[PDB]
C-alpha cells in the first residue's frame, strides 16, 4: 500500500492555539474563577517600542491607502524573527503588546541556574538580528531586554464565556524594572536573576543606583559547548519540539481536534478573531487604521505583594468591567500587570462593533467602572485614562504565535494618563470636545510631562454629572 505523508495540521483548534502560550494550551485548570497557580521560571521582556513607534510614519499620505497593511507587514517581519529565536531557545511567548513581548522559561528551582544561561544566549542572539538594521536613515530598529528569575504566580480570571490570564509577583515586577533600565542593545538582569545565575558564564557591570546588572559578555569556560549544553537543558523543557516533530516551532502545531479543549481555549480569543479562524471573515479584515476610544483601567492593590488577595479582587473587577463593556460592544484587548497595578486595555469602536456616540458612552463606562472598582475589597486606587483617535489594529507576531494588538500614540497617552493622574478618570481633548456632555462635567487639568508623549494637548478629568 501507498504511504501518503504530511499530517494535516490546519484545524481550528491549531489556529486558536496560535493566539495562546503553552502555559494556557497545555494547562488543564480547574473551573474555579479565579484560578491561581505558582511555579518558578526565567522571564524575558523585549522592548519593541523602537519599531512600534513606526505607527506615525505609516499614518502619512505617502502610504496611500495602505498604511495599516504596510505597518503589519514590516512589524511582523521583525517580530517574527524575535519569536522564532525565543521558540527555538525553548521559551513560551506569554503575551504581545504594542511596546513589548514577554516570554517565559518555566522550570524546577534546581534548573534556574542553567536556564538563565540559555535565556542570556537567546537575548544576545536577538540583539544580533538587529546589528545592521534600519529604515529611511534610522537604526531605531534595535531592542532592549530585561531578564528576571524566581517565583511566578499565574492568575486566570473570567466568566462562562471569556477567560484572561496574567503572570504576577516579584520576578514579574523585576523583569519590567530590568527592561526600563536597559538602553538599546542592552541585556539587564534583575538582582534575583544575577544572584541565581551561573556567574562563570558572564561578565557584568553595575547599574548606577541599582542592584540589577548589565550583561557585557557571555564568555563560557574552555570546554563549554552551547549545543551540547542546550541539549542537556531540553530534558527540563516539557514541550520542546522533538523526534518526528523536531522540524516544528511549537508542539501546539500538532494539536488535534478536541471539543472540550477547544471550548476552553476559544474563551481567551476575541469573537472577530474566531470568525476569521473559522474562514467566515477575510484574513486581512482586522488589519486597519481605525478611529477608536481607548479606556485604560489601572487597579492598584492595598497589599500589592499578595497573589491570594489580588486574584479575587481582579475577578470581581473583571465581572463588572465585562458587564459595562457589553452594553457598548467595548472589548478588553489586553490585561497587564507589573508595578502591582493590574491594567485593562479596553477599546470602543473595534472592527464591526462601532457605535455612533462612542465618546459619551466611553466616558459613562469609565465612570461606572471607576465607581464600582473603587468599592472592590483590596482595591486601593482605581485610575482610568480615556483617549480617542486613529490607532493601528491587527494580528501581530509569527504565523505560529501571534495576537490581536492595538498600537498608537492614543494607546500610549491613555496608558500614561492613568499613571500620571492616579485615582481619577481622565480624558484627552478629542474625547472632551466630541462628547455630547456639558463642560461643568469636566475639570481642565495641569499639564504633566509624560514619558513618550509629546504634545498631549489639554487634558481633563471627567468629574461626572454632579458636584458630589
Ligand atoms: C506592557 O507590555 C506587556 C507585554 C507583554 C506582557 C505584559 C504583561 O504585563 C503580562 N502578561 O501576562 N502577565 C503579565 N503581567 C505586558
Swiss-Prot record:
Residues 42-179, 293-418 form the Guanylate cyclase domain. ATP binds at residues 47-52, 99, 144, 406, 412-416. Mg(2+) 1 binds at residues 47, 99. Cleavage may occur to generate the active 48 kDa form. One of its GO terms (molecular function) is magnesium ion binding. One of its GO terms (cellular component) is neuronal cell body. Signal peptide: none annotated. The keyword Cytoplasm applies. Mg(2+) 2 binds at residues 47-48, 99. Keywords: ATP-binding, cAMP biosynthesis, Cell membrane, Cell projection, Cytoplasm, Cytoskeleton, Lyase, Magnesium, Manganese, Membrane, Metal-binding, Mitochondrion, Nucleotide-binding, Nucleus, Repeat. One of its GO terms (biological process) is intracellular signal transduction. Hydrogencarbonate binds at residues 95, 167, 176, 337. Detected in airway epithelial cells and testis (at protein level). Weakly expressed in multiple tissues. Expressed in brain, heart, kidney, liver, lung, pancreas, peripheral blood leukocytes, placenta, skeletal muscle, stomach, thymus, airway epithelial cells, duodenum, jejunum and ileum. Very low level of expression in bone. Its main location: membrane. It is found in: Cell membrane; Cytoplasm, Cytoskeleton; Cytoplasm, Perinuclear region; Nucleus. The N-terminal guanylate cyclase domains are required for enzyme activity. Fragments or isoforms containing the first 470 amino acid residues are fully active. It is linked to Hypercalciuria absorptive 2: A common type of hypercalciuria, a condition characterized by excessive urinary calcium excretion. Absorptive hypercalciuria is due to gastrointestinal hyperabsorption of calcium and is a frequent cause of calcium oxalate nephrolithiasis. Catalyzes the formation of the signaling molecule cAMP. May function as sensor that mediates responses to changes in cellular bicarbonate and CO(2) levels. Has a critical role in mammalian spermatogenesis by producing the cAMP which regulates cAMP-responsive nuclear factors indispensable for sperm maturation in the epididymis. Induces capacitation, the maturational process that sperm undergo prior to fertilization. Involved in ciliary beat regulation. Belongs to the adenylyl cyclase class-4/guanylyl cyclase family. This is Adenylate cyclase type 10.
Amino acid at each position: 500500500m501507498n504511504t501518503p505523508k504530511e499530517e494535516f495540521q490546519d484545524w481550528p483548534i491549531v489556529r486558536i492555539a496560535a493566539h495562546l502560550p503553552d502555559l494556557i494550551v497545555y494547562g488543564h485548570f480547574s473551573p474555579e474563577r479565579p484560578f491561581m497557580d505558582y511555579f518558578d521560571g526565567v522571564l524575558m521582556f523585549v522592548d519593541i517600542s523602537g519599531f512600534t513607534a513606526m505607527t506615525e510614519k505609516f499614518s502619512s499620505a505617502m502610504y496611500m491607502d495602505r498604511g495599516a497593511e504596510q505597518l503589519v507587514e514590516i512589524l511582523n517581519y521583525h517580530i517574527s524573527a524575535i519569536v522564532e529565536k525565543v521558540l527555538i531557545f525553548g521559551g513560551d511567548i506569554l503575551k504581545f503588546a504594542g511596546d513589548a513581548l514577554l516570554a517565559l522559561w518555566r522550570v524546577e528551582r534546581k534548573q534556574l541556574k542553567n536556564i538563565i544561561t540559555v535565556v542570556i544566549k537567546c537575548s544576545l542572539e536577538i540583539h544580533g538580528l538587529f546589528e545592521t538594521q534600519e529604515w529611511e536613515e534610522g537604526l531605531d530598529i534595535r531592542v532592549k531586554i530585561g531578564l528576571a528569575a524566581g517565583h511566578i504566580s499565574m492568575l486566570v480570571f473570567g466568566d462562562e464565556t471569556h477567560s484572561h490570564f496574567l503572570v504576577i509577583g516579584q520576578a514579574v515586577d523585576d523583569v519590567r524594572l530590568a527592561q526600563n533600565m536597559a538602553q538599546m542593545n542592552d541585556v539587564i538582569l534583575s538582582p534575583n536573576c544575577w544572584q541565581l545565575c551561573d556567574r562563570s558564564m558572564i561578565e557584568i557591570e553595575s547599574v548606577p543606583d541599582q542592584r540589577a546588572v548589565k550583561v557585557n559578555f557571555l564568555k563560557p569556560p574552555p570546554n563549554f559547548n552551547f549545543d551540547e549544553f542546550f541539549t542537556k537543558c531540553t530534558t527540563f523543557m516539557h514541550y520542546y519540539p522533538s523526534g518526528e516533530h523536531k522540524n516544528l516551532l511549537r508542539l501546539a502545531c500538532t494539536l488535534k481536534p478536541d471539543p472540550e479543549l477547544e471550548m476552553s481555549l476559544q474563551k481567551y480569543v476575541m469573537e472577530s478573531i474566531l470568525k476569521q479562524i473559522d474562514n467566515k471573515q477575510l484574513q486581512g479584515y482586522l488589519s486597519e487604521l481605525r478611529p477608536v476610544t481607548i479606556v485604560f483601567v489601572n487597579l492598584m492593590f492595598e497589599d500589592q505583594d499578595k497573589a491570594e488577595e489580588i486574584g479575587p479582587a481582579i475577578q470581581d473587577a473583571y465581572m463588572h468591567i465585562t458587564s459595562v463593556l457589553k452594553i457598548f460592544q467595548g472589548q478588553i484587548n489586553k490585561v497587564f500587570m507589573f508595578d502591582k497595578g493590574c491594567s485593562f486595555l479596553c477599546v470602543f469602536g473595534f472592527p464591526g462593533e462601532k457605535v455612533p456616540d462612542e465618546l459619551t458612552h466611553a466616558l459613562e463606562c469609565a465612570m461606572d467602572i471607576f465607581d464600582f472598582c473603587s468599592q472592590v475589597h483590596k482595591i486601593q486606587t482605581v485610575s482610568i485614562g480615556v483617549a480617542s483617535g486613529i490607532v493601528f489594529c491587527g494580528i501581530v507576531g509569527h504565523t505560529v504565535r501571534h495576537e490581536y494588538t492595538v498600537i498608537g500614540q492614543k494607546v500610549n497617552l491613555a496608558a500614561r494618563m492613568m499613571m500620571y493622574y492616579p485615582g481619577i478618570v481622565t480624558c484627552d481633548s478629542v474625547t472632551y470636545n466630541g462628547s455630547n456632555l456639558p463642560a461643568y462635567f469636566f475639570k481642565e487639568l495641569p499639564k504633566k510631562v509624560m514619558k513618550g508623549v509629546a504634545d498631549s494637548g489639554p487634558l481633563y478629568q471627567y468629574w461626572g454629572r454632579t458636584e458630589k
